[PDB]
DNA sequence: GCATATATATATGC
DNA sequence: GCATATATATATGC
């Protein structure tokens, strides 16, 4: 037996890779609960999106099948259908080998959300079967895997097509043995695709559930502005949607703002169309140049007096709705961990802060009335915040 | 030439493992700053700690070399010195292959910090050079890597040692090309190792910084009680140090708690001697149980009434300082992410909430004067909080 | 029908 | 500059 009194060469083991991910899923998707479960879905969809963000495809069709598996069809270029430089088909590289793919700087993708090269393999490793249909250059190629991403067929030609017809169609059963639930939730996927559809002013995403025949479809002519509105729908707005966009040593930033009656700060941020829910170097940029440009503004118009300290950030965000969406080139792309919740690209902080800072300073100079009322609300906020502290402190 | 318009099988690159941690350092230590740099220390210490937790090593010393490299010596069993079955020294397999080790429950280890099979390998990949030295079985073996972990010797026997003596000595220089800083910080390391000491009664930990001639040692006999006591040192207490402890399903919970005249809570938790700075299922059951037990004591003794609302867990934790250290078995260990920052194992919410609730019940039932000052403390809390709500609301 | 989680929303302090 | 907890709503499983 292996011991403890007996730690020899025999005791160190090497996982075959997809096996590493079956053993330590937590490292790759976070958790094996339903939140875990849906990260598989996001991995495949992010792949169709990265195709669309490079220019290929105007339609992604997610589909919960009767039997419980899920499908992502796109009209992008297709996965390469030949022999890879390593003696199994390239598709087989995508799905079974880790740290492999097109987004390492080579030039196959423009800006793009994937960057680790694990996504499709992680989905593959964690499924009890998985199928690919590629459409390329007149032909349709299929291949299947079973029992933790194990090839059971080579890539294999099964049909012809119109020649203009291209794209990828993945379908996987998540593994009952890995996940405490394998019940895909139509409500979760609907809300995700909707989030994504905002971010492709030119794309249509769809979800179809053959379990219930429910179906929805998303499309948005004005993108991040439509996003902000959709955050303030059944709410009551105290400003028109501000829309600021710009570029800067290859960064591309798009931002939409609109205040509401409310008191919440509610601001959503995205690197290369990938929601970064914990914020990051980009969100900090925005937060910054609001507080700077508002405080600077109110000092220049005397509405915060001279001997009067500077409002705080909380104040200026109280009631805010903001969608921030940056494209960051691959050479500058850093997130904080195999996930993609937080953004560590130190360049994004001056990028955004810079671009925002200019656009905003110039919006207020133009709408004096709107901008004064924004500074008066901010003043009212620090008044409330201070009254709470006054109180909480009196009581001790 | 590889572009958007020419994407066939050469646009997919396969990164050799250690190159991947160099390509995407965020996925692997989350940042390439002072915080990332100090991650490379903690991985090598946790490896040493893991030996002591299985019973091997009474000592762990850490040195910041004049040249700015850092050593970590342990007297544990030493890494296996022979030939791994994949055809290379086992030492090599540790420092150069990802997803490899003795902690996937094979028996080499009891319960350990580590579990991913990557830490040693990450430190090597991010180092201008790395040197191991194993003492086992009468011999001192030694092996050197350069240029992000490519081996420049093999595992070479370099001399003699006495036949019962054992240990591993890991020296590495962080790679200045990767990190924005490679100054190791003595205060930082001091602090971490202090804390690693409170959980290792059988180990004395050392830090020497040959840059400046300063050293500290660390040894504790009392675990989380010595830890809580130090957490409160220059504060004023208002309670003895409380210590619960219990076992369940092979898990082991230990926790120390103690209150101060302050308004802050100070909960520190640990899985397998590894610090979980974001909590996780085990901190949460810790907190759950404090709250539920204390409101039950509230209503049973009548300091809360029918008409009154249950107190928030926030109220009960003001001035709280606590250290929760659990031991969780490999076959249940699971973090959210590669990062070990928060625990994700489901069975630990019940276990810790079981052990503490039972134990803390028993204690209030029997320390009623104190139990009532506590409850009264949470109330005057709640009245501060609920004073701030009204005095804020009364401002809008 | 009971308690389960789930979608959402505010709350400062170190 | 940084971490969610829950408050209480509703929807759904034991
Ligand atoms: N739908 C698709 N269409 C075309 N190519 C694809 C598609 N999905 C994956 N690929 C290719 O397969 C590679 C592997 O992607 P993937 O396994 O998800 O990792 P990745 O996109 O690079 N980066 P990450 O998603 O951060 O893991 C990609 O880089 C693409 O070249
Ligand atoms: N100080 C040491 N003494 C003895 N064996 C060691 C030591 N350091 C590492 N090892 C061996 O190397 C293996 C892998 O080290 P490491 O790569 O950091 O992996 P891990 O500790 O298993 N997993 P992880 O640390 O989760 O990032 C361990 O399982 C041990 O067998
Ligand atoms: N009393 C408080 N305790 C903890 N966090 C707070 C408190 N008051 C405000 N916050 C912060 O308020 C933020 C709300 O803004 P969000 O857009 O969700 O990001 C959170 O990130 C909290 O860190
Ligand atoms: Mg991807
Ligand atoms: Mg380790």
Residue numbers in the entry:
A (entry chain B), B (entry chain A): 5 to 400
What text does the study give?
In this study, we have co-crystallized the ParE ATPase domain with short DNA duplexes in the presence of adenosine 5'-[β,γ-imido]triphosphate Adenylyl-imidodiphosphate (AMP-PNP), a non-hydrolysable ATP analogue that induces dimerization of ATPase domains to close the ATPase gate.
We report the first co-crystal structure of a topoisomerase ATPase complex with T-segment DNA captured inside a cavity formed by the protein dimer. Two ParE44 dimers were present in the asymmetric unit (AU): one dimer had a trapped T-segment DNA duplex in its central cylindrical hole (with evidence of weaker hole-bound density in the second dimer, likely washed out by the two possible alternative binding modes of the palindromic DNA to the second protein dimer). The DNA experiences in total a complex and asymmetric 39.4° change of direction. The major and minor grooves of the duplex are oriented towards opposite RNAse P-like domains of the ParE44 dimer and are almost equalized in width due to kinking. The structure reveals that one DNA end is bound in the ParE hole and is bent; the other 5′-GCATAT DNA end is not bound to protein, protrudes into solvent, adopts a B-form helix and is unbent. Interestingly, the DNA is bound asymmetrically in the hole. Thus, the top strand (asterisked in Fig. 2a, d) is bound by residues derived uniquely from one or other RNAse P-like domain in the dimer (but not both), in contrast to the more symmetric engagement of the bottom DNA strand (double asterisk) by pairs of residues S268, R396 and R400 contributed by both subunits.
